[PDB]
Design a protein around this ligand. Sequence first.
Ligand SMILES: Cc1ccc(N[C@H]2CCN(c3ccccc3Cl)C2=O)cc1C(N)=O
Length: 171
Amino acid sequence: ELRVGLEESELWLRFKELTNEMIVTKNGRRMFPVLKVNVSGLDPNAMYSFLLDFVAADNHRWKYVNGEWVPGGKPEPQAPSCVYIHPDSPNFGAHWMKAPVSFSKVKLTNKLNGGGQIMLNSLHKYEPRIHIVRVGDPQRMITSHCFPETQFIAVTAYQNEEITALKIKYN
Ligand SMILES: Cc1ccc(N[C@H]2CCN(c3ccccc3Cl)C2=O)cc1C(N)=O
């Protein structure tokens, strides 16, 4: 009954086809595309919080060489666990289900700086993951959901000029 669907999956797949890249900066940078999901099968009367984190996909980093992403060395030590709390939290299941849940305000950074920003290692691959937690639950039940369409490589600057162009075209 619980269903969490990626919105604009076709657009994400265009970026994923090229290998998607997300800029990280000292002060933090919002994502494009924005991660948005539709949710069904929550209790409309209950209250939930929506959380987001980013899971490392490989035991190595990457490098863009001759127009191709290739394994580019041993990984750096894993990034700190950073979780983003959706600012609508806590809210009724009715709230989360009446309209897609958008994580427009989350910012990716390469420094532990000011904010609820997400710390990522440049040239490493990550995948957004959403968690739903119910308030007042003595079992502290959490549901976790991964989105393979939204995988990307964190970068201090775009490597693929097709990514640079695509981000301008669709944004
Ligand atoms: C009657 C009723 C009870 C429960 C639910 N939803 C469950 C499943 C997900 N979940 C849930 C619970 C804890 C943490 C995270 C989640 Cl996601 C819930 O609270 C729907 C109905 C209904 N509308 O019939």
